[PDB]
């Protein structure tokens, strides 16, 4: 429901490989309110919402302002790893 | 002639009220009478183009075209530009005169009447005919005719549907089945 | 078949021009109203015999 | 039968002509009327024009109208100081009520 929001910065050049070894998820959200705020996550934050409350259900990306509802869309997952990249969101209302 | 007056006296307002139009502009009409002559034997003899053109000059007061090939295929022994067939279009009052020569004079010289096959509408309401002989007319002499040649008529209308064309050409003759 | 040919002024007789023709299509001596320098006048021109 | 409409081909011929201080003319048809304009590019401005039958032209439904129109065009244009014009052919030929415009335009000031 209430994931942990870490609002990122504008230019990630080759700093990014530090987050791939730390198991981090930089999270696109383009939708109704937000045009782009990439957001940190830990890779063990999402699977216990997908396999707990549903694989496509309501996930709220809120910082206790307005209440947002997301529709996790796509991901490339590279070979030989099986780990998480390219996590896009989609903020659709009630 | 007959049928302009016979249109505007009997054919037209009946078909206005059979399909309940908003104006007489939506009435269906008939534009062309397309006439082929498929010889197909100029490969054999170039003197085959003698007879058909003369017979069309006997039928209509015209001289037809001479259609070229548009293909060069030896399966029929054809090069491009080879003479194959002829074309005759009717407009004006030779529409109605030739139609009445069809209906009221010529066409009962087809023995064993099995009418006209009613599946000949091009889908969207234009008749076609393939006629087998040519001795149907009073404009035709015997000894001039020496083959089993025939005609090809494509009556072209302005109608969208098919039964509009049916009611038109039934009202203008066409001994159907 | 084809021939490198010359054209002749039919009035003042100078071998003015040069062209080509296919001698089984055009079996005759050509005639073209070509310009002439010595007369400054458009002149009939024929093949040199 | 789709009877093909007739401004479309006229504009095709317009554009294949127009691909080929000396402004245009224009020549038009209808069933009943013939207009004219004098335009520059890329100002996009008509400097003068003339009606078909509106002001004082008619008095016989021939091409005689068109000669009067071609008079009126050059009469209004010569007051504006223009003798350098270029004929549009429109999308037409020169047989009917178009040479009636043209020869009336030539013999009233417009130089060709």
């Amino acid at each position: 429901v209430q994931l942990e929001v870490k609002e990122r910065a504008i230019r990630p050049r080759s700093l990014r490989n530090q987050l791939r070894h730390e198991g981090k998820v930089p999270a696109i959200v383009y939708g109704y309110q937000i045009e782009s705020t990439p957001i940190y996550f830990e890779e063990k934050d999402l699977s216990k919402i997908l396999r707990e409350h549903g694989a496509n259900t309501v996930i709220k990306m809120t910082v206790d302002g307005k209440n947002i509802n997301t529709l996790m869309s796509k991901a490339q997952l590279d070979t030989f790893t099986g780990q998480m990249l390219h996590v896009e969101f989609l903020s659709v209302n009630m | 002639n007959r049928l302009k007056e016979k249109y505007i006296k009997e054919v037209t307002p009946s078909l206005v009220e059979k399909f309940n139009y908003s104006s007489v502009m939506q009435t269906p009409k008939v534009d062309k009478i397309v006439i082929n002559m498929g010889v197909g034997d100029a490969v054999s003899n170039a003197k085959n183009l003698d007879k058909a053109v003369e017979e069309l000059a006997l039928i209509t007061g015209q001289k037809p075209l001479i259609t070229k090939a548009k293909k060069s295929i030896a399966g029929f022994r054809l090069r491009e530009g080879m003479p194959i067939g002829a074309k005759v279009t009717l407009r004006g009052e030779r529409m109605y005169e030739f139609l009445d020569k069809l209906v009221t004079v010529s066409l009962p010289r087809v023995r064993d009447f099995h009418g006209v096959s009613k599946k000949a509408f091009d889908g969207r309401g234009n008749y076609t005919l393939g006629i087998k002989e040519q001795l149907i007319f009073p404009e035709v002499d015997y000894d001039l005719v020496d083959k089993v040649r025939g005609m090809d008529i494509v009556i072209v209308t302005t109608a969208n549907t098919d039964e509009e064309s049916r009611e038109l050409l039934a009202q203008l003759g066409m001994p159907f089945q | 078949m084809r021939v490198n040919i010359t054209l002749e002024c039919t009035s003042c007789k100078e071998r003015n021009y040069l062209t080509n023709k296919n001698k089984r299509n055009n079996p005759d001596r050509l005639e073209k109203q070509k310009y002439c320098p010595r007369e400054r006048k458009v002149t009939l021109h024929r093949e040199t015999k | 039968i789709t009877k093909p409409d007739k401004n479309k081909t006229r504009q095709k011929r317009h554009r294949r002509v127009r691909n080929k201080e000396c402004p245009r003319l224009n020549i038009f048809r209808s069933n009943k009327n013939i207009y004219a304009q004098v335009i520059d590019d890329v100002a996009g401005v008509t400097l003068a024009s003339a009606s078909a039958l509106d002001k004082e032209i008619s008095g016989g439904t021939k091409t005689e109208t068109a000669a009067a129109v071609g008079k009126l065009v050059a009469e209004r244009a010569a007051e504006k100081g223009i003798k350098k014009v270029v004929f549009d052919r429109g999308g037409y030929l020169y047989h009917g009520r178009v040479q009636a415009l043209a020869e009336a335009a030539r013999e009233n000031g417009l130089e060709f």
Binding site: - | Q62, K63, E97, T104 | - | -
Partner: protein
């Protein structure tokens, strides 16, 4: 009608045994039989006697 290249057509009146289809044109023309005012004032030679009246798509 482009000139000098087209054959004949004139209102050849038609007759038969009955029913008188006195309307149309024709090609084979000739001797005056009924030059009639209510029809075309021309030569009616096509009077060959197949009726277009009796074959059982008529009656």
């Amino acid at each position: 009608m482009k000139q000098d290249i087209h054959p004949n057509y004139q209102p050849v009146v038609f007759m038969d045994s009955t029913t008188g289809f006195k309307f149309l044109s024709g090609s084979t023309k000739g001797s005056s039989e009924t030059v009639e005012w209510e029809d075309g004032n021309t030569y009616p030679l096509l009077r060959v006697e197949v009726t277009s009246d009796s074959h059982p798509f008529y009656t």
